[PDB]
């Protein structure tokens, strides 16, 4: 399973809010 992306994406999740 290639999806664990989706805790690489929480770890991105800090700086793809950074408004």
Same mark, same amino acid.
């Given at each position: 399973?290639? +999806?664990?992306? +989706?805790?690489?994406? +929480?770890?991105?999740?800090?700086?793809?809010?950074?408004?």
């Amino acid at each position: 399973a290639k +999806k664990v992306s +989706k805790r690489l994406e +929480k770890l991105f999740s800090k700086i793809q809010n950074d408004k």
